[PDB]
Amino acid sequence: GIVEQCCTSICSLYQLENYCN
Amino acid sequence: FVNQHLCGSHLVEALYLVCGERGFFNTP
C-alpha cells in the first residue's frame, strides 16, 4: 500500500494522487 | 545523498498538498 510504495520505495505523483478520495 | 522517500509526517504533508479539496482517509 501507500507506506510500502511511497516510504519504502519511491512513488510518483500519480501513484500518490490515486490514494486521495 | 538526498532521498526521495515520503515517510511519516512528510507523507501526511504530501497527501494534504496533492489531494487538496478531494481529501484522503475519508468515506462518502
Author numbering:
A (entry chain A): 1 to 21
B (entry chain B): 1 to 28
Direct quotes from the study:
Insulin is a 51-amino-acid protein hormone with two disulfide-linked chains (A1–A21 and B1–B30) that is responsible for the maintenance of metabolic homeostasis, with an impact on cell proliferation and regulation of ageing. It exerts its functions through binding as a monomer to the tyrosine kinase-type IR, which is an (αβ)2 heterotetramer in which each individual αβ extracellular chain comprises L1, CR, L2, FnIII-1, FnIII-2 and FnIII-3 domains. Therefore, we undertook further mutagenesis-driven studies of insulin, focusing on the TyrB26 site that we assumed might be the critical structural pivot of insulin conformational activation on its receptor.
Interestingly, the [AsnB26]-insulin increased its potency towards IR-B to 142% with a minimum loss of IR-A affinity (83%). This makes AsnB26 a unique single-mutation full-length analogue that is ∼1.7 times more IR-B selective with an overall wild-type-like IR affinity. In contrast, the substitution of TyrB26 by a shorter polar side chain in the AsnB26 mutant results not only in loss of the water-mediated ‘hydrogen bridge’ but also in a repulsive character of this interaction owing to the incorporation of a polar side chain into a hydrophobic environment. The most important feature of these analogues is the occurrence of the B25–B30 bend that detaches this part of the B-chain from the insulin core. It seems that the B24–B25 peptide bond in [AsnB26]- and [GlyB26]-insulins serves as a ‘rotation axis’ for the B25–B30 chain, sweeping it almost 180° away from its wild-type direction. Moreover, the peptide NH of AsnB26 increases the stability of the B26 bend through a hydrogen bond to OD1 of the A-chain C-terminal AsnA21. The side chain of AsnB26 is also near enough (∼3.5 Å) to the CO group of ThrB27 to make another hydrogen bond that would stabilize this region even further. Therefore, the introduction of the Asn residue in the B26 site enhances the stability of the newly formed, bent insulin conformer. Therefore, the structure of [AsnB26]-insulin with the characteristic B26 bend is likely not to be accidental but represents a favourable and stable conformation of this analogue. Moreover, the unexpected but significant IR-B selectivity of the AsnB26 mutant that is correlated with the characteristic bend of the B-chain of the hormone may give the first structural insight into the structural origins of differential insulin signalling through the IR-B and IR-A isoforms.
